[PDB]
């Protein structure tokens, strides 16, 4: 029943997916050993969406862990929930990609794509009614951006009709940790736009901005950014794992949220968000959730929505609430801020409400937005690419892998085409 098959690519992808697995195992009440320990039967009916039923009433997640290094596999298996995973889905090479997209897409990951495909196919045939694939990866470096796009293309080729949603942490200028990120991002979005039905753009800088300027953490580590990602990870698929008054699965979002086929790079967000010493004082009412939700500080990318127009926004609320105030805020936001939403398309909001709130939360709101302002990251990536493209650096480490100049040129042309379409409707 609407089974969803998860794939992890790169160290970023597999660690954030592992923490997502931890979060939704707590939501479904799954013991670290894999046994069920939840309180209500509501956690139990839609276990088949993320986990496989096995002997002993223990449940194994439908995740395929893919990497080119064994060290990340070693860390994840030794992590808090390493034991719950399938030993077979730990499919990995030995030599790393070295943050080389060409390595992952032609040499290093091409040999392991056969060993990942035979696992993803068995996972899919284990499903009763497959709905799609949620894939976690990073546009930075050559592992997540490199092999991730290749296997995404393969699964899209053999699964043409299933939903393809990807959550992509993507490079940024001021919190860049690797020199050669823009090549990787340009060569990755080239395949992401053509193949993926859904892509969530996540930028690390805005995660940092959330954890300082909203969460007031003095030392928010990398796991806290993983937590911020996993919150929306769990939120976007809430409707098809739990009952709610307005059920909106992934394709419910899709039919409402992407006006033209290529305009599918979106803006995630989550509410509520407070510091430790300020949650005691906050009124968690739904209107306040809304005023927090469309704030430019709550978002997870540097693209400020005030520099563009929203095409479609998705607000999947959660908890035991009525909904007239839901409609009134969703119309007030787009009425008083009608200059920030495309007036030519009147009702830019898709509303979904779930009946069971997250554990420890009385209510929650998950933000998904289509703004023309998201081109801020794309054109900046293209500009940084040009600053390292126009007269030939670093290309020997790609062309040595069989990579060629004209494909880089087409990738840049496609970035320019994308930013053109997203500026067209602004």
């Amino acid at each position: 029943m609407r089974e969803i098959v998860h794939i992890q690519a790169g160290q970023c992808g597999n660690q954030i997916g592992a923490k997502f697995w931890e979060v939704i195992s707590d939501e479904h009440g799954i013991d670290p050993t894999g046994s069920y320990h939840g309180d209500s039967d509501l956690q139990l009916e839609r276990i088949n969406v993320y986990y496989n039923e096995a002997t002993g009433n223990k449940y194994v997640p439908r995740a395929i862990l893919v990497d080119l290094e064994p060290g990340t596999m070693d860390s994840v298996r030794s992590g808090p929930f390493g034991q719950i995973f399938r030993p077979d889905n730990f499919v990995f090479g030995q030599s790393g990609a070295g943050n080389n997209w060409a390595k992952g897409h032609y040499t290093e990951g091409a040999e392991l794509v056969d060993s990942v495909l035979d696992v993803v196919r068995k996972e899919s045939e284990s499903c009763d009614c497959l709905q799609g694939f949620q894939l976690t990866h990073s546009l930075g470096g050559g592992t997540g951006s490199g092999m991730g796009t290749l296997l995404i293309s393969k699964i899209r080729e053999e699964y043409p009709d299933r939903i393809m949603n990807t959550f992509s942490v993507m490079p940024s200028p001021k919190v860049s940790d690797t020199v050669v990120e823009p090549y990787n991002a340009t060569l990755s979005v080239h395949q992401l736009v053509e193949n993926t039905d859904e892509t969530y753009s996540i930028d690390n800088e805005a995660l940092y901005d959330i954890c300082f300027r909203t969460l007031k953490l003095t030392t928010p580590t990398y796991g806290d950014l993983n937590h911020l990602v996993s919150a929306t990870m769990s939120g976007v698929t809430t409707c098809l794992r739990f009952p709610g008054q307005l059920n909106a699965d992934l394709r419910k979002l899709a039919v409402n949220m992407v006006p033209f086929p290529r305009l599918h790079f979106f803006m995630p967000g989550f509410a509520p968000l407070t510091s430790r010493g300020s949650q005691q004082y906050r009124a968690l009412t739904v209107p306040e959730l809304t005023q927090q939700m469309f704030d430019s500080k709550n978002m997870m990318a540097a693209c400020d929505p005030r520099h563009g127009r929203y095409l479609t926004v998705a607000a999947i609320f959660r908890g035991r609430m009525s909904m007239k105030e839901v409609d009134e805020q969703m119309l007030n936001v787009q009425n008083k801020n009608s200059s920030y939403f495309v007036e030519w398309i009147p009702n830019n909001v898709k509303t979904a409400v779930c009946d069971i709130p997250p554990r420890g939360l009385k209510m929650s709101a998950t933000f998904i937005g289509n703004s023309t302002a998201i081109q801020e990251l794309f054109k900046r990536i293209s500009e940084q690419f040009t600053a390292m493209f126009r007269r030939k650096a670093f290309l020997h480490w790609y062309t040595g892998e069989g990579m060629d100049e004209m494909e880089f040129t087409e990738a840049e042309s496609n970035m320019n085409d994308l930013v053109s379409e997203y500026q067209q409707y602004q």
Partner: protein, 430 residues
């Protein structure tokens, strides 16, 4: 005798069914288990077996299981015939396209199979009461596929249409007008009398009259159920002037295509408010024509009344009805079309309204059901047509409808049909 098969399509349809049957079991005194502790007043809606069990003649059809298998877990899991409540595998994605060609195609044949096995025990089947929402993918596509085959297999039988219609301001999806416009062919060609439901108007109703600041859709449902039960009141209980379901729709309908009346219910009033009013027949008669009590956000004072039907129930004397309607025809602010100087159809029933124990509605000795067709309701479509233009002018979301097997020109036939309907409801007002 006098059986009616109720159809429930989409999440809205199945949940409004859950509330309606909640009202029906209470008013006819059936436990949630289907038993009768201790007249054939239930034969209109419920079937009887040898063991003393009341089995409703209803189908819950949803292309997705969550709401219906939630019903399989609720207090009414044993009331319903489990395989007359049909669940699909893939949701409708708020898309008329898949619901009308792709996903409902494999499930509709079982739906008509169950409809036939519900028809074959009905000795006096009166009509159909199908519930859905315009904006929803299931309530649009599957209903569009279903009335098509029902109109050729049960062409003689009346098909009343109770549908939930989008608000001028409140909306839950951006594709709602797309789903709504392709529904218009079904109501015009394969429906006999359609009843349109606006969420924002009734939001205002519960805000002002019920004094409740925070109701849910369940409060909306526990009044749509009252409106449908009041429409079916004459078929199930005794009355001085019982209005047959065919008599009703003959009194509503001036022309085969003009069959879209508004609905209002009185007295919508909270329990704290019921005490301080005597609540005469006149004031519930006067409250119905008040634009602040309309179920659809359109001003009747902006339009002209064609047919008026007074469906009273409870302790109401027909003399008081005549006295009230004399005052109604006395004021000029309520101007009827030059078609109907007779104006009013009167229906009185002896059963007082039944109160839901968890409801927000007060217990009143008298209740009136107002159903009227008017030309002012075209405004509720006069914003939806301009709305649909505002999306179709770029082909806003059509690639999905195209990608799921819909002809591109079906939108052209759709807005041509709504324009024809809008014109048809304007010439009759002269």
């Amino acid at each position: 005798m006098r059986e009616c098969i109720s159809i429930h399509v989409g999440q809205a349809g199945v949940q409004i069914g859950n509330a309606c049957w909640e009202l029906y079991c209470l008013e006819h005194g059936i436990q949630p288990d289907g038993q009768m502790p201790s007249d054939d007043s239930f034969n209109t809606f419920f079937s009887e077996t040898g063991a003393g069990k009341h089995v409703p003649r209803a189908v819950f059809v949803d292309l997705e299981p969550t709401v219906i298998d939630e019903v399989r877990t609720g207090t009414y899991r044993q009331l319903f015939h489990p395989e007359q409540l049909i669940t699909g595998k893939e949701d409708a994605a708020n898309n008329y396209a898949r619901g009308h060609y792709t996903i409902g195609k494999e499930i509709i044949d079982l739906v008509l199979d169950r409809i036939r096995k519900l028809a074959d025990q009905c000795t006096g089947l009166q009509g159909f009461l199908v519930f859905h929402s315009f904006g929803g993918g299931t309530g649009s596509g599957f209903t569009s596929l279903l009335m098509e085959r029902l109109s050729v297999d049960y062409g003689k039988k009346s098909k009343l249409e109770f549908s939930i219609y989008p608000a001028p301001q409140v909306s839950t999806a951006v594709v709602e007008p797309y789903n709504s416009i392709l529904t218009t062919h079904t109501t015009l060609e394969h429906s006999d009398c359609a009843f349109m439901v606006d969420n924002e108007a009734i939001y205002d109703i519960c805000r002002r009259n019920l004094d409740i600041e925070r109701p849910t859709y369940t409060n909306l449902n526990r009044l749509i159920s009252q409106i449908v039960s009041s429409i079916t009141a004459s078929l199930r209980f005794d009355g001085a002037l019982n209005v047959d379901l065919t008599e009703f729709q003959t009194n509503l309908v001036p022309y085969p295509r003009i069959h879209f009346p508004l609905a209002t219910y009185a007295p919508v009033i909270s329990a704290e408010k019921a005490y301080h009013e005597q609540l005469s027949v006149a004031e519930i008669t006067n409250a119905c024509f008040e634009p602040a009590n309309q179920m659809v956000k359109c001003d009747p004072r902006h339009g002209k009344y064609m047919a008026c039907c007074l469906l009273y129930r409870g302790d109401v004397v027909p003399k008081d009805v005549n006295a009230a309607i004399a005052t109604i025809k006395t004021k000029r602010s309520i101007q009827f079309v030059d078609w109907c100087p007779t104006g009013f159809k009167v229906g009185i029933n002896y059963q007082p309204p039944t109160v839901v124990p968890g409801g927000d509605l007060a217990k009143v000795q008298r209740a009136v059901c107002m159903l009227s067709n008017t030309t002012a309701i075209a405004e509720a479509w006069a914003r939806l047509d301009h709305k649909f233009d505002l999306m179709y002018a770029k082909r806003a979301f059509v690639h999905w409808y195209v990608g799921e097997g819909m002809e591109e020109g079906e939108f052209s036939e759709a807005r041509e049909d709504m324009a024809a309907l809008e014109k048809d409801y304007e010439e009759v007002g002269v």
